[PDB]
Amino acid sequence: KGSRFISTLQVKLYGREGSSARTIKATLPYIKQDIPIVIIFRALGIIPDGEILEHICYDVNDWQMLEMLKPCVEDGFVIQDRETALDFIGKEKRIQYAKDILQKEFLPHITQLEGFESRKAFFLGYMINRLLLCALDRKDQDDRDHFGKKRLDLAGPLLAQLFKTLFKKLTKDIFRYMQRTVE
Amino acid sequence: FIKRDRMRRNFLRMREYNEFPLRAIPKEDLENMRTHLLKFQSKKKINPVTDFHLPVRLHRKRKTRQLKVLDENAKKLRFEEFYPWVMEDFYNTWVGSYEAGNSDSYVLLSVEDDGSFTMIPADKVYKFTARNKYATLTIDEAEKRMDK
Amino acid sequence: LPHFSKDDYSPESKGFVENSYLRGLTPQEFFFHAMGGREGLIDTAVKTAETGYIQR
Amino acid sequence: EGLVEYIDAEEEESILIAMQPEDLEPAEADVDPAKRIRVSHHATTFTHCEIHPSMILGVAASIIPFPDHNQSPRNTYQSAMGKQAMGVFLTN
Amino acid sequence: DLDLERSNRQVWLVRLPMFLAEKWRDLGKIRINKSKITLLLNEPHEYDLELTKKVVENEYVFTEQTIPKKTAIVGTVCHECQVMPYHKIVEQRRNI
Amino acid sequence: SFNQFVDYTLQDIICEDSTLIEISFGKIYVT
Amino acid sequence: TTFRFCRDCNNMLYPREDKENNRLLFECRTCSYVEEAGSPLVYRHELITNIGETAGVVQDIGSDPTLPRSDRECPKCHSRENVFFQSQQRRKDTSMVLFFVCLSCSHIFTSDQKNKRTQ
Amino acid sequence: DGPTMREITETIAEAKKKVLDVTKEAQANLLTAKHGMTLRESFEDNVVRFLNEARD
Amino acid sequence: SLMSCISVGTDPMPIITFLSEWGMEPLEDYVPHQSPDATRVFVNGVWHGVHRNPARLMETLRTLRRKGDINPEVSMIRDIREKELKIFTDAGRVYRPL
Amino acid sequence: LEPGHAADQEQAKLIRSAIEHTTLKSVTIASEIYYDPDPRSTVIPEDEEIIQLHFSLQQSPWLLRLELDRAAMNDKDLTMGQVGERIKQTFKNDLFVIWSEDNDEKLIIRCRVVAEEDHMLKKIENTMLENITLRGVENIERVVMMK
RNA sequence: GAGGA
């Protein structure tokens, strides 16, 4: 609800199998291009590698998965601190821009409040984990049609959207007339 | 067989133990002294600030009324407390971060030398992380090293 | 179908209708057959449009 | 009283429905040849039993007599046609 | 004077069923037994306690009255616990 | 769905980004 | 294989050579922490993997309703109660072999009669 | 005819049995994948062939 | 189909509250390598925590639904093999009785 | 087939071998990079026995050691002889190459460059697995005899 | 919208 805002974060895994340097770049809203993930993780405050892998490969025997990850670690090895990471994103304001993007546009459906970077970090780690799990052939790709993944918008939600929009417009115009009463 | 509507008739026819007071602290000592939480991260398990170093300072790094986006003051106020605070010497450092996770249900028990325990409502909670432990960051130089 | 255990490869678990149209189909079989039949309908619908365009 | 239960597609993934109440779980125990070939109970750890299978059909399909003897495309055609039939649509 | 005051006060922390926590953000008497604790209210219900983490490491408590300001570091987390529920009467109130 | 809407969603659409630089929106009434 | 982390830096301990005694030296390229190796092995590829077949064997799997049940007698234990399933490898070229889980001693064992397997 | 009916039935039963035997063998990992196709595919094809032969 | 209905959605908060009340170590204190058997607990796809002994939890949740305490249109899956326990009070789901 | 040879299934197998594109990756099992600076004593005491031969009748300290499957090596009817030939002739310029003998119960092949190694070596191994057509011709995947 | 075929 709440002027329902649809932000579609995606994670992309680069390069076919065997093609060396398979690296994972995440996609954020309002960003020049994809970002190597480890950048994002540090941008959320998980700085060390070991902590990041802990955020991703939940079992420390999955050296399979760890090997899969290592390229992204090496990719991100350049940056080593949070604020640098926020610098990567696009003043004197660039950092604050990045931070506010994360607090409002990165995974809206977790929160848009102040301190939950631990959450969004963990959740992102999980998302990556599942992507890896697929690309390691241990789950099959998602079934696009499983009816559990569908929803039906009955008269309720349809009118909900429609009316929310109309009413937002009505507020806009009321405010505008209020202004035109500068006189 | 066939569908039978006579079943209406069918049913119709068939029918050590310590104990302490937990006193409330004076409002006044609280009224300036907000309480918060310390969390470092280095896994250098002990992290004793006493044995960190010294001295250990701590500090944070048109027309008439027109359209304003509204919000409760505190978040606005929280938004406006964005200078994280650090421990230094004048070498080791630590930088804290706002947890914002469980300010709800956390009451600090005043485990003093006296057994009386005052239930201190934890006000905030911060996660502290080291920094400049290798001062190796090339914020603009590094971006050069990326493309190569 | 949820009416089955997991990893059953027995013919009726994966869709071997056995009764005749005379004997009628058990609900699984009925459903399976419905899936097959819809595939048929779709293929026909697509195929006519194709062959129409090809012929033109 | 928790005798009946609402189940959606996601949860369906982790249950074990029985088709017919009785025969599917009486116990482990001569057959009319005309009767179709029901499989068995064959399993024990059910958790739910279907209310009645004929409820998988939608509205239009429910008109068809014996739709379990027909070839499915026929069912679909009827479901479509049934909306053309003349008849009383409303009492007023 | 930018520095701590003592930086050693070893304190305890608990997590309280919020139906009871909000009551405490504005005394009591507690059975502080051995590794088995229940909580008598300053009265309705009766509650129990668990020891979540005895080794309460890395973590301490501080307080406050390039922008600096004055600070007073209370001291350590001595240990922390968590509250659980008259637990039947509480659970009856809990389910809501 | 419709009842749910007209009983809750209608209101909580209003009790939202409602107040305007001030003007307030309160209880919503349906005839 | 394994990875290593700079017990102070806590980062990827890359390997390196001693260059005089010429033994391995893991070095944190964020820091100065250095260590040798426990093994001369550095990396291993494993292009055909026998792992992941019997994955997620939790000490709860007996509670799964949908899982089938056999009678085959446990070798380790001797129950005749068992849940069995195919490999979780979910690769196209995967065998059909079954993995039985005793419901008493929770001891995995396989349907295989080629040899003995352990996932 | 009746006799014909139960003869049909037992024919189907034979089919089921052959399928089952193939299955048991596959799960004993004794199935030999004909060249050029997956073990799993080989099994699946075998089953489909049996079933169609049975129907006919 | 004849008996299928469509969920209308429910405020999830009380469920989350209850979960916290019954375990569900909150996320921020989750340390995987030492808590390897935790079942991730989701709600409307929002990973809210982890928990141990999920079995009894699931039991309790089920029971609660089965006496109207939790609105019965709420689905509650417990994938045993993925150590996940999703929940949805989401509006728009499709469900049928049993 | 040419008319010879009209019906000699044996001949057909010969050809099928002769044309089917067979790559190194398809025959091995797992690849491993070791640190053995010892020219002539494998850290492992199993390839070491091989080093008792295949060694003698300016180096690098980084062994790359290779494991293949006997079943595939024989279905493809391959001999670590030929494969060694393949890799050797593919370089002969950088790698002393040693293979277990086709007798050996395990299919073990060892190579060493003659630096900033352990990263280039990775590229090399990838190239070995992928860009090495042991026999047969490109784009030919599966050859299935028929009558 | 509809829609038969």
Ligand SMILES: [Zn+2]
């Ligand atoms: Zn280091």
Ligand SMILES: [Zn+2]
């Ligand atoms: Zn056993």
